[PDB]
């Protein structure tokens, strides 16, 4: 009888291991696909980098984000060396808007000594005078932020809601 | 008593 009990519990544990492995593999397939889609989104972002006009508009926007975010009397602007004159023009365009938006006079310099690493597809970053408070407004950080905030909705879009999701709140 | 005295003394700052 205990031989039989050993045999039955043996098959039960074996089947449980098999089921656990099956769940592991399928979930891994799902999240591998999600990461692949994220990589594709990185590629779409990289192609978006090159169109000059909308890219300049986006850089103006990001610079204004940094201005409205830091709010310090002194500021520093860092970016990719290639896009240096574009962001210089963007800063010159942006400063009056901030001046009339906050009524605060601020000096904005551009770090010309240290530039962003090449792997950054685009975007900018702001320090304050002492370089202790920072704010990263790079394109990759934005991609991360909206990706994480969007993750549940994209699950719902790709796979649809579970059948047991009878109500919402 | 000891614990209360400790917090009381610290209250000065």
């Amino acid at each position: 009888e205990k031989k039989e009990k050993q045999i039955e519990q043996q098959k039960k544990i074996q089947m449980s291991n098999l089921m656990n492995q099956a769940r592991l593999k399928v979930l891994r397939a799902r999240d591998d696909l999600i990461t692949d889609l994220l990589n594709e989104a990185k590629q779409r972002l990289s192609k978006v980098v090159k169109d000059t006009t909308r890219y300049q508009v986006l850089l103006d926007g990001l610079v204004l984000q940094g201005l409205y975010q830091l709010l310090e009397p002194r500021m520093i602007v860092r970016c990719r060396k290639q896009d240096f004159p574009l962001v210089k023009a963007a800063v010159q365009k942006a400063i009056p808007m901030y001046k009339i938006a906050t009524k605060k006079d601020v000096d904005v310099q551009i770090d010309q000594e240290a530039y962003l690493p090449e792997e950054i597809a685009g975007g900018v970053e702001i320090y304050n005078g002492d370089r202790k408070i920072k704010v990263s407004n790079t394109l990759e950080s934005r991609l991360d932020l909206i990706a994480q905030q969007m993750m549940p909705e994209v699950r719902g879009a790709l796979f649809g809601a579970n059948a047991n999701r009878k109500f919402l709140d | 008593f000891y614990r209360l005295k400790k917090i009381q003394e610290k209250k000065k700052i």
Binding site: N20, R23, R30, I133, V135, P152, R155 | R3
Partner: protein
């Protein structure tokens, strides 16, 4: 929904125990979540417990080690902690922080839920009336429970309360869906406890419907503050949303109390009884009542937490406060364990709100309350005469005293003493109770009414 770019701060103005004090933060928010970078690539997380001016206080989940005032940075999110939620949480295990401890990946958050929960109208709650069969004669019968109640298990060190928890989880069922899903959460236990529970769960092939958490003794202490709330939030989701009848097993709440003591002592807040901070009454209220059915919905939450008991102090703050909140209690005594009783459960201090759940009209049987009460009273008198026995020798006892002693002895030998894996039915335990009643003549049945007495005693 979206949000602005996050902000980095490097102004660490001090470190003290599990706390880290910053300043020059712009518009800090209470209960805000932050991340921490170390001089190496290691990352951590924490939250905010205090704010005033540009100063802010940051509790660190992973503890404090090698923190610098020149290399460590900080990141500030924009809102309260919100955690992954999905049906896939079943069949998975996680650590104290909810990260996947097994090799599986980060769960896909079908939704984000607030850890702190949200209140529910008392009018929008439904009384739990369905007795849950457990199989233990000490629990079924004398201290019957219902589907939606919550009952803590008082126990001391060196006792086999874990075996009792496993037995309950195994034999959980309804008196006459299929069974309960299980949301287990460990609060600072040694490897033995976790491994034994894992073995028990896989023995019955119930991994397909267990979501489990693990906080081991080696982990940082501060994680235990957040650990149980994750499990409760997930269980709340499965109960009020998936309409699944769940059973949440918490354990070692004393470690939760210790962690809260750490946090309070670090902040130099006003202490109270035994150095415990004042506000854990509110905190335990928050952690405890999240249970009971609601109108217009199916599923339920039954909550059985396990509390270890420092020394043997019923008047200790932790068990006492837990007594004021939960509606019941099941006591474990080392005496029965020394007398070799597998369910060493002292029924005298135990108590539950079977008070109108085990009626008998429509429920199991009509006599339930009467037999329970008579056994209870007879047991009390048995303990009394046992105490009197140590004073004066056996010769001084009357016949009724010997009858009480014999009834007591046979009672723990038969009713209380139940073997592991024994699934007694409620009717069986009632019959056993009657057989125990038969020891006395009918005239000593001071509590049973006439009708039942004439119905069953002959």
């Amino acid at each position: 929904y979206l949000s602005q770019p996050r902000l980095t701060y490097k102004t660490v103005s001090g470190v003290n125990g599990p706390l880290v004090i910053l300043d020059h933060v712009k518009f800090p928010r209470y209960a805000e979540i932050v991340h921490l970078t170390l001089p190496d690539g290691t990352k951590r997380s924490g939250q905010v417990l205090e704010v005033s001016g540009s100063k802010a206080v940051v509790q660190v989940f992973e503890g404090t080690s090698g923190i610098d005032a020149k290399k460590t940075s900080c990141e500030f999110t924009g809102d309260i902690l919100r955690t992954p939620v999905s049906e896939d949480m079943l069949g998975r295990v996680f650590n104290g922080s909810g990260k996947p401890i097994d090799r599986g990946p980060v769960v896909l958050a079908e939704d984000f839920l607030d850890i702190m929960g949200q209140p529910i109208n008392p009018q929008c709650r439904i009384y739990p009336e369905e007795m849950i069969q457990t199989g233990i004669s000490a629990i079924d019968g004398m201290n019957s429970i219902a589907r939606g109640q919550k009952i803590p298990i008082f126990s001391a060190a060196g006792l086999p309360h874990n075996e009792i928890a496993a037995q309950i989880c195994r034999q959980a069922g309804l008196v006459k869906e299929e069974n309960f899903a299980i949301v287990f959460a460990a609060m600072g236990v040694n490897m033995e406890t976790a491994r034994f529970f894992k073995s028990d769960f896989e023995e019955n092939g119930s991994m397909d419907n267990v979501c489990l958490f693990l906080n081991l003794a080696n982990d940082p202490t501060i994680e235990r503050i957040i650990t149980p709330r994750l499990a409760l939030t997930t269980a709340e989701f499965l109960a009020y949303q998936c309409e699944k009848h769940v059973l949440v097993i918490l354990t070692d709440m004393s470690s939760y109390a210790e962690a809260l003591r750490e946090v309070s002592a670090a902040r130099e807040e006003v202490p109270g009884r035994r150095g415990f901070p004042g506000y854990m009454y509110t905190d335990l209220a928050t952690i405890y009542e999240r249970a009971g059915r609601v109108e217009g919905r199916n599923g339920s939450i039954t909550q059985i937490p396990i509390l270890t008991m420092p020394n043997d102090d019923i008047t200790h703050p932790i068990p006492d406060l837990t007594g004021y909140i939960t509606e019941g209690q099941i006591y474990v005594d080392r005496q029965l364990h020394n007398r070799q009783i597998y369910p060493p459960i002292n029924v005298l201090p135990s108590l539950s709100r079977l008070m109108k759940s085990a009626i008998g009209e429509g429920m199991t049987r009509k006599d339930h309350a009467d037999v329970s009460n008579q056994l209870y009273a007879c047991y009390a008198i048995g303990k009394d005469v046992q105490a009197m026995k140590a004073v004066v020798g056996e010769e001084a006892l009357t016949s009724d005293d010997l009858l009480y002693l014999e009834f007591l002895q046979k009672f723990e030998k038969n009713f209380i003493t139940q073997g592991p894996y024994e699934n007694r039915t409620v009717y069986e335990t009632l019959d056993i109770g009657w057989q125990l009643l038969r020891i006395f003549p009918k005239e000593m049945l001071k509590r049973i009414p006439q009708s039942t007495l004439s119905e069953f005693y002959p």
